[PDB]
C-alpha cells in the first residue's frame, strides 16, 4: 500500500521575506590562496588598465 496524503497548503507571505534588491555582503573571505609576493603584481595589473582605458577614451 502506497497511500496518498493531500498537499498542505501555504501562503504567499512565507518565502518572500528573506530577499531584496542587494547590499548584504562584503567580500570573498573564505577563498584559500597563496600569491605570496605577487600582491604587487596584481596591484600593477589593476593600476595599468586605468591608464589604458584613459588613453582609449582620450
Amino acid at each position: 500500500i502506497t497511500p496518498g496524503i493531500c498537499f498542505s497548503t501555504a501562503s504567499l507571505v512565507l518565502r518572500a521575506t528573506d530577499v531584496h534588491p542587494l547590499q548584504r555582503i562584503d567580500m570573498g573571505r573564505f577563498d584559500l590562496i597563496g600569491l605570496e609576493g605577487r600582491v604587487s603584481r596584481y596591484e600593477a595589473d589593476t593600476f595599468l588598465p586605468r591608464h589604458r582605458l584613459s588613453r582609449r577614451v582620450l
Partner: protein, 48 residues
C-alpha cells in the same frame, strides 16, 4: 548470498511533497529543479 535474508518490506510507503504556490515564484522554483538535475549522473552505477 542475499536472497533469503531480505524479506518483504513494511506495507506502507509515502513519497515527497512540494508545497503549493499561488503567488510569484520562478526563481528557486527553477533552481531547485536544476539542483535536483545535478545528482542524476552521480548516483548512477552504485552496484546495488
Amino acid at each position: 548470498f542475499v536472497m533469503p535474508p531480505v524479506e518483504a518490506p513494511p506495507p506502507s510507503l509515502h513519497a515527497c511533497h512540494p508545497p503549493p504556490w499561488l503567488a510569484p515564484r520562478q526563481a528557486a522554483f527553477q533552481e531547485q529543479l536544476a539542483s535536483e538535475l545535478w545528482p542524476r549522473a552521480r548516483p548512477l552505477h552504485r552496484i546495488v
